[PDB]
Design an enzyme around this catalytic site. Structure first.
Site, PDB file in Angstrom:
ATOM      1  N   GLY A 295     -44.723  34.521  14.279  1.00 31.79           N
ATOM      2  CA  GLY A 295     -44.569  34.360  12.818  1.00 31.79           C
ATOM      3  C   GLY A 295     -44.780  32.833  12.482  1.00 31.79           C
ATOM      4  O   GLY A 295     -45.128  32.591  11.347  1.00 31.79           O
TER       5      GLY A 295
ATOM      6  N   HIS B 262     -56.291  31.837  16.213  1.00 31.09           N
ATOM      7  CA  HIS B 262     -55.913  33.283  16.457  1.00 31.09           C
ATOM      8  C   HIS B 262     -55.200  34.012  15.354  1.00 31.09           C
ATOM      9  O   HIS B 262     -54.806  35.174  15.515  1.00 31.09           O
ATOM     10  CB  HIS B 262     -55.156  33.321  17.830  1.00 31.09           C
ATOM     11  CG  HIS B 262     -53.782  32.671  17.628  1.00 31.09           C
ATOM     12  ND1 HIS B 262     -53.409  31.424  18.062  1.00 31.09           N
ATOM     13  CD2 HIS B 262     -52.725  33.191  16.976  1.00 31.09           C
ATOM     14  CE1 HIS B 262     -52.135  31.218  17.707  1.00 31.09           C
ATOM     15  NE2 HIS B 262     -51.671  32.274  17.017  1.00 31.09           N
TER      16      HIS B 262
ATOM     17  N   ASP C  96     -57.418  26.105  19.448  1.00 28.52           N
ATOM     18  CA  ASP C  96     -56.698  26.919  18.416  1.00 28.52           C
ATOM     19  C   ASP C  96     -56.554  26.247  17.081  1.00 28.52           C
ATOM     20  O   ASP C  96     -55.444  25.778  16.711  1.00 28.52           O
ATOM     21  CB  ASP C  96     -55.363  27.402  18.979  1.00 28.52           C
ATOM     22  CG  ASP C  96     -54.800  28.745  18.446  1.00 28.52           C
ATOM     23  OD1 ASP C  96     -55.495  29.490  17.731  1.00 28.52           O
ATOM     24  OD2 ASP C  96     -53.596  28.997  18.829  1.00 28.52           O
TER      25      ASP C  96
ATOM     26  N   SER D 215     -47.084  30.613  14.133  1.00 31.12           N
ATOM     27  CA  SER D 215     -48.432  30.174  14.390  1.00 31.12           C
ATOM     28  C   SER D 215     -49.052  29.642  13.112  1.00 31.12           C
ATOM     29  O   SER D 215     -48.996  30.228  12.017  1.00 31.12           O
ATOM     30  CB  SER D 215     -49.378  31.305  14.905  1.00 31.12           C
ATOM     31  OG  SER D 215     -49.148  31.473  16.318  1.00 31.12           O
ATOM     32  N   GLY D 216     -49.790  28.531  13.290  1.00 31.03           N
ATOM     33  CA  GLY D 216     -50.552  27.889  12.206  1.00 31.03           C
ATOM     34  C   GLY D 216     -49.722  26.766  11.555  1.00 31.03           C
ATOM     35  O   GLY D 216     -50.328  25.952  10.833  1.00 31.03           O
TER      36      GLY D 216
END
Ligand SMILES: *[C@@H]1O[C@H](CO)[C@@H](O)[C@H](O)[C@H]1O
Ligand SMILES: *[C@@H]1O[C@@H](C)[C@@H](O)[C@@H](O)[C@@H]1O
Ligand SMILES: [Ca+2]
Ligand SMILES: [Ca+2]
Lengths: 251, 183, 55, 108
Positions: A187, A41, A90, A189-190
């Site tokens: 902030g 996302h 994800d 995410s990933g």
């Protein structure tokens, strides 16, 4: 990150910073010289891919010490199974236009083997989640990389401990605190969820979602990377192909 | 696979076995135990048994609170069930005591019996482990009594009996009665 | 403008920083928020222009 | 109480059956016993050889990194890329300056 600390410069050297036109988008995890793993996302309605840059060896956003390495993401790969604007599956595999140079300040995290990951790492209680994300739910994002240690949960316990949100699938796992004190946030995410084992760190999770940040009765939800090691390895050996955005078959 | 139920801790002088149901049919089990913050440790790998000895794990730190879980497998996360939490120090049962000897007032001596807890490859006694938390009760014969924080009673003159007690306990406060002694 | 336009911004459960637009009825004007990146509601646009277009 | 006493009074020695295996010592209890085992054994009866579970789900088979179980044979140990398995056959040692999941700073 909610309730962590500044990750001491160079102690989270696999941590990546994804920006789009100099503005902070999400984090990533360097798993080698030209591949970074992130969240599916993070790429929602991205239109100018020429501006999408990965930064390695970054620490303090307010200044440029010279240890930072920046590369254009040549390619964004996701599973054919991820449906745009959802939570399931994800994950993304980013190919750097040019490799980074390994330094004291830029080192990949080991992508583990799936049985290792599942037989041993999933049973290691704590792991570190890091980022330059929000310090609080409606708070400001950090200038310096934060790091947090969270305990993992098997899905049944997570469910049971949760106040009764999307579904927690086999492609996810929960980690954190149900006391509204510590979690990852907007902030992050990933970003990596990294597990320490017999002296080596390994990628176990990806920052994904939560019903707010550090919300009482809730845990942070991460992508269960062990589910994807093989997809990820076939791709790193696959001859490189054209599109900018690729939705590869999964399994 | 069916899910194990009725998880119960069976513990005496730190010897600790977790027991469950039901007897398996084309299914195996595996135990995992941990302290609140440590890693999960697998025990009794794919067992057909409905018990798992965990002494070796719990004697590591008798003060710590444990949780074990029983996983079920055909003979994606496993099918499992969690056990009550167990604090060895506070709940292990006190084993049946023993009169060591007695001698003429009478002086009664209760043996300082060993436990499953090891320190540099040697079993510790009840006293090593409970220090001053441990007290004894003598019964003499109508019947009388005497308590000490030691392993001796000095009575007035016979049959005696002893019972170990951790008065500070909320659960499993008193051992059973040792085999009686008479002069 | 349609009804959705009265709906408060929805950042959703994703932890990405997508700068999006939404219409502030109260203000009777479009403004920005950070969408997390999944489960977006209808009052959420890519730009002022189509947001303005829409509400 | 007296009933607890009496129950106690009229119970026998569960150790009569010599249940503690492999060098073990039985200690009688109220309608039960305890087995004190030798250091290489465990179990209710000392039936378990602490020595016989060298498999991958048992503390990673004692491997530092990757573990492979093998029928009719011993488990194998292996390492990630940029690492080499040692002569001990369980440990891994880096083959590059900058091996994955090592923090140069902490190391140096
Ligand atoms: C010896 O005696 C005990 C008493 O019940 C029994 O449970 C064991 O199975 C046997 O070996
Ligand atoms: C009783 O306990 C075990 C540990 C061994 O020492 C036996 O020889 C002894 O009789
Ligand atoms: Ca900088
Ligand atoms: Ca008996």
């Amino acid at each position: 990150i909610v309730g962590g600390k500044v990750c001491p410069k160079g102690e989270c050297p696999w941590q990546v910073l994804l920006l789009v036109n100099g503005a902070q988008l999400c984090g990533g995890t360097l798993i080698n010289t030209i591949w970074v793993v992130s969240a599916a996302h993070c790429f929602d309605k991205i239109k100018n891919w020429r501006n999408l840059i990965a930064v390695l060896g970054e620490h303090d956003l307010s200044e440029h010490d010279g240890d930072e390495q920046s590369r254009r993401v040549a390619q964004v790969i996701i599973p054919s199974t991820y449906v745009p604007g959802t939570t399931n599956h994800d994950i993304a595999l980013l190919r750097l236009h040019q490799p980074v140079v390994l330094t004291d300040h830029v080192v990949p995290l080991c992508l583990p083997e799936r049985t290792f990951s599942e037989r041993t790492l999933a049973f290691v209680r704590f792991s570190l989640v890091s980022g330059w994300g929000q310090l609080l739910d409606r708070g400001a994002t950090a200038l310096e990389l934060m790091v947090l240690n969270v305990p993992r949960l098997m899905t049944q316990d997570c469910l049971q401990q949760s106040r009764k949100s999307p579904n927690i699938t086999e492609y996810m796992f929960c980690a954190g605190y149900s006391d509204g004190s510590k979690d990852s946030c907007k902030g992050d995410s990933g970003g990596p969820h990294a597990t320490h084992y017999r002296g080596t760190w390994y990628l176990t999770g990806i920052v994904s979602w939560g019903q707010g940040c550090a919300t009482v009765g809730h845990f942070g939800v991460y992508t269960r990377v062990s589910q994807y090691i093989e997809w990820l390895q076939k791709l790193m050996r696959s001859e490189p192909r054209p599109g900018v955005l690729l939705r590869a078959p999964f399994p | 696979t069916v899910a194990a139920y009725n998880l119960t801790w069976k513990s005496t002088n730190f010897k600790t076995i977790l027991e469950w149901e039901p007897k398996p049919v084309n299914q195996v089990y595996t135990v995992q135990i941990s302290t609140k913050s440590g890693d999960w440790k697998s025990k009794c790998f794919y067992t057909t048994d409905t018990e798992c000895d965990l002494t070796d794990e719990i004697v590591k730190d008798v003060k710590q609170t444990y949780l074990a879980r029983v996983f079920s497998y055909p003979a994606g996360e496993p099918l499992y069930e969690n056990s009550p939490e167990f604090t060895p120090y506070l709940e292990t049962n006190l084993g049946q005591p023993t009169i060591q000897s007695f001698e003429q007032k009478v002086n009664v001596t209760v043996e300082d019996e060993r436990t499953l807890v090891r320190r540099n490859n040697t079993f510790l006694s009840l006293r090593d482990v409970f220090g001053k938390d441990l007290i004894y009760t003598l019964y003499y014969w109508g019947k009388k009594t005497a308590k000490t924080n030691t392993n001796e009673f000095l009575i007035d003159v016979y049959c005696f009996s002893v019972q170990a007690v951790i008065p500070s306990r909320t659960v499993n406060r008193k051992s059973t009665d040792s085999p009686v002694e008479c002069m | 403008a349609p009804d959705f336009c009265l709906e408060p911004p929805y950042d959703g459960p994703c932890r990405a920083l997508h700068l999006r637009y939404f219409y502030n009825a109260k203000a009777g004007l479009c403004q920005t928020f950070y969408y997390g990146g999944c489960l977006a509601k209808r009052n959420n646009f890519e730009s002022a222009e189509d947001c303005m277009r829409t509400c | 109480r007296t009933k607890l006493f009496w129950i106690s009074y009229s119970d026998g020695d569960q150790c009569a059956s010599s249940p503690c295996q492999n060098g073990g010592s039985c200690k009688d209890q109220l309608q039960s016993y305890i087995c004190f085992c030798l250091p290489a054994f465990e179990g209710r009866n000392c039936e378990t050889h602490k020595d016989d579970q060298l498999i991958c789900v048992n503390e990673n088979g004692g491997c530092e990194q990757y573990c492979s179980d093998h029928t009719g044979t011993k488990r194998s140990c292996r390492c990630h890329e940029g690492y080499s398995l040692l002569a001990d056959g369980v440990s891994c040692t880096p083959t590059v300056e900058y091996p994955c999941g090592k923090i140069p700073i902490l190391e140096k």
